[PDB]
Amino acid sequence: INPEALNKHIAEIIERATNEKPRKFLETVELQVGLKGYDPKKDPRFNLPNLKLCVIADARDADRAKKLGLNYVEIEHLQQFNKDAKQIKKFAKSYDVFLASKSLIRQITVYAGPGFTKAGRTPLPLAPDEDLELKVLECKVQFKKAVGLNWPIGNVKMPASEIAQNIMTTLNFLATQLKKGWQNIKTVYIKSTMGPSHRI
Amino acid sequence: PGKVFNLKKGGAVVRIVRKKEERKTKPHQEFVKSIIQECTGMAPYEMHIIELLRMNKDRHALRYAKKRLGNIKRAKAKRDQLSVYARNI
Amino acid sequence: GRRIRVQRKGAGSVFRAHVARRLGAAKLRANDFAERTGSVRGVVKAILHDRGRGAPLARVQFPNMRGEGRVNELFIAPEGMYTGQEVFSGNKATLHIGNILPVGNIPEGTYVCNVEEKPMDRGCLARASGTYCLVVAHNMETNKTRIRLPSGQKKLISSKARAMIGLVAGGGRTDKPLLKAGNAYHKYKAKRNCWPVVRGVAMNPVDHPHGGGNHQHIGVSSCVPRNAVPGQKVGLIAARRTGCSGGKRR
RNA sequence: GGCGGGCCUGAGGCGGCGGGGGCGACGGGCGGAACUUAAGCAUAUCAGUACGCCCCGGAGGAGAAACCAACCGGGAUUCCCC
RNA sequence: CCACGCGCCGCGGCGAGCCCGAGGGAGCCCCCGCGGCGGAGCGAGCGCGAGACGCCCCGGGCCCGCCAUGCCCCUGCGGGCG
RNA sequence: ACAGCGUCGCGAGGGCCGCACCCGGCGCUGGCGCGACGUGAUUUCUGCCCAGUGCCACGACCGUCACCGUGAAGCGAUCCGC
RNA sequence: GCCCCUGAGACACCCUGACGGCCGCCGCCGCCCCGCUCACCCGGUCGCGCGGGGACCCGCCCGGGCGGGGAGUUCGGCUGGGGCGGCGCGCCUGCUACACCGGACCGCAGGCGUCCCACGGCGGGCUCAGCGAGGACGGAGACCUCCCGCGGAGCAGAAGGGCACAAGCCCGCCCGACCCGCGCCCCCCGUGCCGGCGCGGGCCGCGAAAGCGGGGCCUACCGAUCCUUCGCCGCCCCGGCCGCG
């Protein structure tokens, strides 16, 4: 892992990154990673856990969640969209991340289904009952058929490498649900569209 | 088990036979092992162990030594003794 | 529980080779410094009849290289040899019938008898009555001459092998039927005690593997594998194709 | 090539001296059964026996710990009692 | 038939005892003479370890171990008391 | 048994046997030879079957199919892999 | 150009992973192929004037076959001789059985070696096969009605008992077809083993409850030692001690 070596380089592609200047923790990173020794008949299917997430509510969202983020929408606000089903079948065009209401989801239950199964998820738990935005962790290490996958880096707009802990959050996990615990992994390198980086 | 139970075992003072003036290889035994090693050279099983060490590290080197010498304690010493030659070339 | 007739054959005694009264071995001249560089002449002393071998044996004496007395060597007789013939034998000896010369020097297509398997083996292949070998080609690629064996396989011998030009004499020996079994008792009276032979289905079962059932049936298939135990190999050994087919020529 | 010396590995002859074979026990080393028993038989068992073989002695073999023990511990072997 | 293993039974000596073991003894049939067997059981083992009666005999009741378990507590998955 | 008649293995660095190994016999031989076979003098002919079952294939390498070897892994007894 | 808008899936947003492909790169490892003589094995001779193999065979050490060519055994029992044609050789129902019980037979009439998480447990409801007499198609016959309906029905299969606000049938639940420790009966030497039965506790179910339940209404449907495998709490390794065994 080299916590001291190249785990302090997560901000290394500084003004080298440019690449649209997204504004975050410098380089996009994403910690490109792969699985070695993973078999089709192996054992790793599940989910578990700058930024691009969306959450909504009608019992406080315009001030609690929409003020300072997300969007100003009730438990409905689609109507003809909940009948055409086009944009929702692939919500990435509309809702980039899906957390459309909690504790008020009762209003939409009557007319919902194809998009929320295609997208895979919609009513995850952030609500006006809790202080809204306390659970901003919609973030995601997904495993089952593909490789390690380029899963989320950990955000960390903070400079230097506080993300080394987040890089190690993926490291703390990942080794979970693997036939050769930590042995079954193949690549320890950092590269993406960001720009010039080095092996972790 | 193999010990009787007398909480207060010990009613007679005991002197410990020990060391017997614990000795060493002494100057000549080591020197001679140098004289012969200088002319005859290293055995083939040893050569493989040293060659394993420059590239591979231990593991398989010990595994060849257990098979050739027949006991890990002799092997652990042999792998270690052989390594001194390894860190030069 | 008793060994078969084949098993007892190699024990010796009774099932051995009668060799008494046989004149001796048939071998060529010893290869030597004179044979290597030149040719030594040799008169034919006689063309005797071997007791065991139907094939004529010819006694020919050569001038001994060292001691004054002439050494006498018995050669399998090549047809056309006459009492008083001078077989000139050596590296430079001609191809006249009867001479002993290095097979490599002998030309392609010749009729040869008493060829040597490896150099100076003193006589090896093609000794039987009426049999012959042909040099298909004296190939110089590896100093190895091709030889077609009497049976017809194609083998090779080192050019330094030596042989006698001319067919082994006594040919047509088996054409005449032996007729009366007595001619067979007399024929094998100079050879092994292999006559008369008792077939497998006749013998009682304790003796032969083919044994005998209620109706004298072989009991199983004669073809027995090449790698079978000595006692088992009593049937046809490793047959590649049993039966009579398109003659024997393909 | 020749010739003569030293060393070294050998070749014959001589002189002195050993060695071989025997004993119905005991003794030392091997090679090695089966009948039997298991109510049959294979592992077992008989038995590390019969018998075969080689060798020694008046006894041989064994023997002065790379040893038992675990104790308020012994101390070569050999035999005997348990 | 004899040996030795065993299970009862009848005697003889002695009694929580009892014992010509091999041996040693100037002795033989006499003197001295251990391991052993009992005296405490039960439990695979860690190990832990019987009182309360009764002419005898039979039960009954209890206590010891191996088990479960309820409480109490010391020195403590240790001890006690059910 | 038998001549005849076919089948079969083999080029000797080989076939087929003896035998505890030593090492023999065929072989003082060499394919008109030596073994291994059935059938049984000629005269006249010997049909049809390869499914099996034998045998046979420097016929194939598909599936299985060993000690080695040697990839990991474990502290190592090992344990999976090819 | 895009999360512009369209698919299961930007592809202009660069990195991976996959298989092919491969410059080439290995102080890596297996495998072959060819020399050479110097072991090793052949053949010549009177070693009087030399050849042929060759790091190969061979021997040897394990390892995989093939292998009556050899050995060593074994080749059940009952039974109107044998008898292996049958299995009464374990097990059950009704006979035979001579009114307690026990009673023979290659004696009769038959079965068993399974099946079912519902075909189980419980609580509730219910009455079944059918005698009639009626009703579109509709009659031997299909359904729906009443009525009389002692079981004449069905309860997984052999047969015999047994059963009616049920032990049948339907429904609503649910796992008691559960654990810990025992005894009793059946065969009986009064031994095992199968099968039940009766309890001391734990814990659940079902119902309002009392109750009832460790299977299928009862009587058939199965298993020693040894060894493997496994479950639960522990104990043991013996001079200790710690992990793995």
CSV table of C-alpha atoms (C1' of nucleotides) in Angstrom, one decimal, chain G residues 46-134:
chain,number,residue,atom,x,y,z
G,46,C,C1',47.3,-65.6,-31.8
G,47,G,C1',45.3,-58.2,-29.4
G,48,C,C1',50.8,-60.0,-37.1
G,49,G,C1',49.1,-55.0,-38.4
G,50,C,C1',41.3,-53.2,-36.0
G,51,G,C1',36.5,-51.6,-36.3
G,52,G,C1',30.8,-50.8,-34.6
G,53,G,C1',27.8,-48.2,-31.1
G,54,G,C1',27.7,-44.0,-27.1
G,55,A,C1',26.1,-40.3,-22.5
G,56,C,C1',22.5,-43.8,-25.5
G,57,C,C1',21.4,-48.3,-23.4
G,58,C,C1',22.0,-51.5,-19.3
G,59,G,C1',21.8,-52.3,-14.0
G,60,C,C1',19.6,-50.2,-9.8
G,61,C,C1',15.5,-47.0,-7.1
G,62,C,C1',10.5,-45.8,-6.6
G,63,G,C1',6.1,-45.1,-9.9
G,64,G,C1',1.9,-46.5,-13.7
G,65,G,C1',-0.1,-50.5,-16.3
G,66,C,C1',-0.6,-55.7,-18.3
G,67,G,C1',-0.2,-60.4,-16.3
G,68,G,C1',-4.4,-68.2,-14.0
G,69,G,C1',2.1,-67.9,-16.6
G,70,G,C1',2.1,-68.9,-11.4
G,71,A,C1',0.5,-69.3,-6.1
G,72,G,C1',-3.1,-69.0,-1.8
G,73,U,C1',-7.9,-69.5,-0.7
G,74,U,C1',-13.6,-69.2,-1.2
G,75,C,C1',-17.6,-71.2,-3.8
G,76,G,C1',-23.7,-69.6,2.0
G,77,G,C1',-28.3,-71.9,4.8
G,78,C,C1',-33.2,-74.0,5.0
G,79,U,C1',-35.1,-78.1,2.4
G,80,G,C1',-40.2,-85.2,2.9
G,81,G,C1',-32.0,-87.1,-0.5
G,82,G,C1',-29.7,-83.0,-3.3
G,83,G,C1',-32.9,-79.8,-3.2
G,84,C,C1',-30.9,-73.4,-4.8
G,85,G,C1',-37.1,-74.3,-9.1
G,86,G,C1',-39.2,-71.5,-4.4
G,87,C,C1',-37.6,-68.5,0.3
G,88,G,C1',-42.0,-68.8,6.5
G,89,C,C1',-33.4,-66.8,5.7
G,90,G,C1',-35.6,-60.4,9.3
G,91,C,C1',-41.0,-58.4,9.3
G,92,C,C1',-46.6,-57.9,9.5
G,93,U,C1',-52.5,-59.1,8.7
G,94,G,C1',-56.3,-62.7,8.7
G,95,C,C1',-56.7,-68.0,9.1
G,96,U,C1',-54.8,-73.2,10.4
G,97,A,C1',-55.4,-73.2,16.3
G,98,C,C1',-58.8,-77.4,18.9
G,99,A,C1',-63.1,-69.8,23.4
G,100,C,C1',-56.6,-67.4,28.9
G,101,C,C1',-51.9,-67.6,26.7
G,102,G,C1',-48.3,-70.6,24.2
G,103,G,C1',-48.7,-73.9,20.2
G,104,A,C1',-45.9,-77.2,13.9
G,105,C,C1',-45.6,-77.5,8.3
G,106,C,C1',-41.3,-75.3,0.7
G,107,G,C1',-49.6,-75.6,4.8
G,108,C,C1',-53.6,-71.8,2.9
G,109,A,C1',-55.5,-66.1,1.6
G,110,G,C1',-52.3,-62.0,1.4
G,111,G,C1',-48.5,-58.1,2.1
G,112,C,C1',-43.3,-55.2,3.9
G,113,G,C1',-38.1,-53.1,2.3
G,114,U,C1',-41.8,-47.5,0.7
G,115,C,C1',-44.7,-43.0,0.6
G,116,C,C1',-46.2,-37.9,2.5
G,117,C,C1',-43.8,-30.9,5.4
G,118,A,C1',-48.5,-32.2,4.1
G,119,C,C1',-50.9,-37.4,3.9
G,120,G,C1',-48.1,-33.7,10.2
G,121,G,C1',-49.9,-31.2,15.1
G,122,C,C1',-54.0,-28.3,16.9
G,123,G,C1',-58.5,-25.3,17.1
G,124,G,C1',-63.0,-24.4,14.6
G,125,G,C1',-66.8,-25.7,11.3
G,126,C,C1',-68.9,-29.9,8.7
G,127,U,C1',-71.2,-34.9,7.4
G,128,C,C1',-69.9,-39.3,4.2
G,129,A,C1',-71.0,-43.5,0.4
G,130,G,C1',-75.5,-43.4,-0.8
G,131,C,C1',-82.5,-45.0,-0.8
G,132,G,C1',-85.7,-42.2,-3.0
G,133,A,C1',-88.3,-37.8,-5.4
G,134,G,C1',-87.5,-33.6,-8.4
